Amino acid sequence: SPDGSRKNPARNCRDLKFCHPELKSGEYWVDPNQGCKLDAIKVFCNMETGETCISANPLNVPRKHWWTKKHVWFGESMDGGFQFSYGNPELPEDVLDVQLAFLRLLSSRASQQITYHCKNSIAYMDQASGNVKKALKLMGSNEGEFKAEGNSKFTYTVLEDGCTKHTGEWSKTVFEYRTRKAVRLPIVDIAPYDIGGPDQEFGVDVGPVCFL
Amino acid sequence: PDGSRKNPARNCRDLKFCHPELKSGEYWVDPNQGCKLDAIKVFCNMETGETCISANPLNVPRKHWWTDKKHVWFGESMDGGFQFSYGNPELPEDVLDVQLAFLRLLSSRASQQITYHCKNSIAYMDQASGNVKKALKLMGSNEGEFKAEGNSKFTYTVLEDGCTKHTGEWSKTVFEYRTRKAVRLPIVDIAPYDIGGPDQEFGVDVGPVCFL
Amino acid sequence: PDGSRKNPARNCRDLKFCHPELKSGEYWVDPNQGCKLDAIKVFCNMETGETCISANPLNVPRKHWWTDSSKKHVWFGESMDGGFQFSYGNPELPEDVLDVQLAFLRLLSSRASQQITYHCKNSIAYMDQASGNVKKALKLMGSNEGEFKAEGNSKFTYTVLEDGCTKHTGEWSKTVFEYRTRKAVRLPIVDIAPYDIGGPDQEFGVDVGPVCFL
Ligand SMILES: [Ca+2]
Ligand SMILES: [Ca+2]
Ligand SMILES: [Ca+2]
């Protein structure tokens, strides 16, 4: 019987939760495509919810002046930019793709949080206008974009917003996207709008993509 | 496996292939495999290999449901209405969701029948006018509707039609939707058109959704 | 699993991952897992790790297929006398079982690709040398309710590997098409619709290449 060890992975964390109810939240190995056990992925299992959470690698975009107004994709367009990747970096992309496809099928929903660190850079709401027209965008895995407004199937939610004014200091805004259409996740890129001025800087902490 | 609760099969088609001696009946299957605890109870047709899952409740009682012509969704709009639900109402809705998702996305084909019980209510053909303009509609599981006419991908077929006149008596019309795109099934709602008058009544018997 | 009939692998990519010493060739795989008995014999490209399933039948004979008495695309399978849609896998297995094995590969692979060859006599396949344009290019039917074309939405355009059909010369030639995608439910190709057909001197045939999943 699977037990979530590297040599004996479970199919996902929900299976571990139910078939091994004594296990606590933490690091486990899961193998959504089953078959060959060697392409298993290392995850965090939330044993309260049954969520399988896969970390981004790299987890973070360092705080820097990145760009010198329009939305600009970090991965697509910025110098030193990269798109976000998930799961054991040593695994071929196609294998990671297949694992995510199976985990999507195994799950009712997926969610992900992302943190925008800001210095003189609006992320969501602009305190002066009270509007979100300068809000950043996120790119999903199905080419779709997650936005502040527009099609309600694709809008993100904001959990805290410390970036509403240029204060010369660092703060942060936290975004979440949650959906039943798990093909849309994980987030692969980010496009700030209020960037490019000499004293504007940002960083990013990419939260894990969680499936249940 | 063998189709018992302790040893469920992936689905009925596998059970037929691997155990051709088994007769049609109740079995336990586990489309998402892995941990066996979320296996579901189904009817296996062992001649076709179909996995058939019953609605629960499967019956809409015969009643005057609507008072007021236009299509009106039973589940969406009528007092006491409900959308049709499938599987062991014991398991959480999200578990059944995933098990059904495996069947909907990875089956060859699917089919489902639904029976409209009618008193003074046209269901498909209107004998007096000679047309199907008053025909009812059905709602699938992929935000699509099944109709008497229009896009031939989404038309249902009528197996018997006893609802063609207002006679003051009870009769029935039987609808089927069959598709190689099983994401479209099961049926989740019904919209009669010829309803609302003081002597008009209907009921429904929801047939099982069957996956190959 | 080792890719034998009694011990089929899930697919060729798993076989490669677990057995780097295995060479390209035929093996038994079982994408739907569960019962082992409905395993399918495939070609594994062990350089890429692709699972390749051959068309059966793989050939549309070379013939005058269509009589034009009207000019538009005409689907071979849907409209032509003796036409058929393309099927894949061991015809010893039930159609529904093959569909399911294919469905696992289509939904859950990273990528898919397929080539198809149009044999032509007095029949433009893609480029029309006389006009210099692709207005007469044939179309292909995918497995997800879409079509693959010379132009339009770039997600659904095919690519042309060689094009020998650009003139009417009274001689046989061929044009080879390929469709590659990260949305594998679009494949395999199930039908073909030539445009430059139906004239009294026009003929075509088709060789359907294997559908390959990663
Ligand atoms: Ca595996
Ligand atoms: Ca299970
Ligand atoms: Ca099998």
Whole-angstrom distance, CA of residue B69 vs CA of residue B194: 7
DSSP string, C81-122: TT-----BS-TTS-HHHHHHHHHHHHHH-S-EEEEEEEEEES
Whole-angstrom distance, CA of residue A208 vs CA of residue C10: 28
Do C99 and B105 make contact, defined as CB atoms within 8 angstroms? no
Whole-angstrom distance, CA of residue C120 vs CA of residue B211: 42
Do C100 and B13 make contact, defined as CB atoms within 8 angstroms? yes
Nearest by Cα to C144 from C115, C181, C177, C173: C181
Element (H, E) at B172: strand B170-179
Do C100 and B106 make contact, defined as CB atoms within 8 angstroms? yes
Element (H, E) at A42: strand A41-46
Q: Compare all CA atoms of chain A with the CA of B104 and give the residue at the minimum distance.
A: A105
List Cα–Cα distances, A163 to A138, A168, A174, A189, B198, in angstroms. 17, 11, 10, 19, 61
Q: Is the CB of residue A43 less than 8 Å from the CB of residue A29?
A: yes
Q: Which two tokens stand for residue C133?
A: 């344009």
End-to-end CA distance of chain C: 18
User: What structural domains and CATH numbers belong to chain B?
Assistant: 1-45 (3.30.750.130), 46-212 (2.60.120.1000)
In terms of C-beta density within 10 A (0-12 exposed, 13-18 middle, 19 or more buried), how is residue C192 classed? Answer: buried
Cα atoms in the 13 Å half-sphere on the side-chain side of B70: 4
Chain C CB contacts of A95 under 8 Å are: 13, 17, 110
Do A106 and B98 make contact, defined as CB atoms within 8 angstroms? yes
Q: B145 CA distance to ligand 2 centroid (A)?
A: 31
Whole-angstrom distance, CA of residue C144 vs CA of residue C106: 10
Whole-angstrom distance, CA of residue A117 vs CA of residue B81: 49
> Cα C214 to the chain's mean position, in Å?
15
Q: B4 CA distance to ligand 2 centroid (A)?
A: 14
Burial B38-72 (b: 16+ CB within 10 A, else e): bbbbbbbbbebbbbbbbbeeeebeeeebbeeeebb
Nearest by Cα to C213 from C8, C3, C29, C90: C29
Whole-angstrom distance, CA of residue A57 vs CA of residue B54: 44
Element (H, E) at B103: helix B93-106
Interface of B with C (CB under 8 A): 1, 9-11, 13-15, 17-18, 33, 49, 105-109, 153, 180-181, 212
Structure solved using which method? X-ray
Q: What is the resolution of this structure in A?
A: 1.7
The three-state secondary structure class of C174 is strand
Whole-angstrom distance, CA of residue B99 vs CA of residue A159: 32
Whole-angstrom distance, CA of residue A178 vs CA of residue B119: 46
Q: Is the CB of residue C100 less than 8 Å from the CB of residue C32?
A: yes
CB atoms near residue A49 (< 10 Å): 14
> Cα A180 to the chain's mean position, in Å?
15
The three-state secondary structure class of C34 is coil
The three-state secondary structure class of C52 is strand
Nearest by Cα to C95 from B180, B134, A151, B187: B180
The three-state secondary structure class of A64 is strand
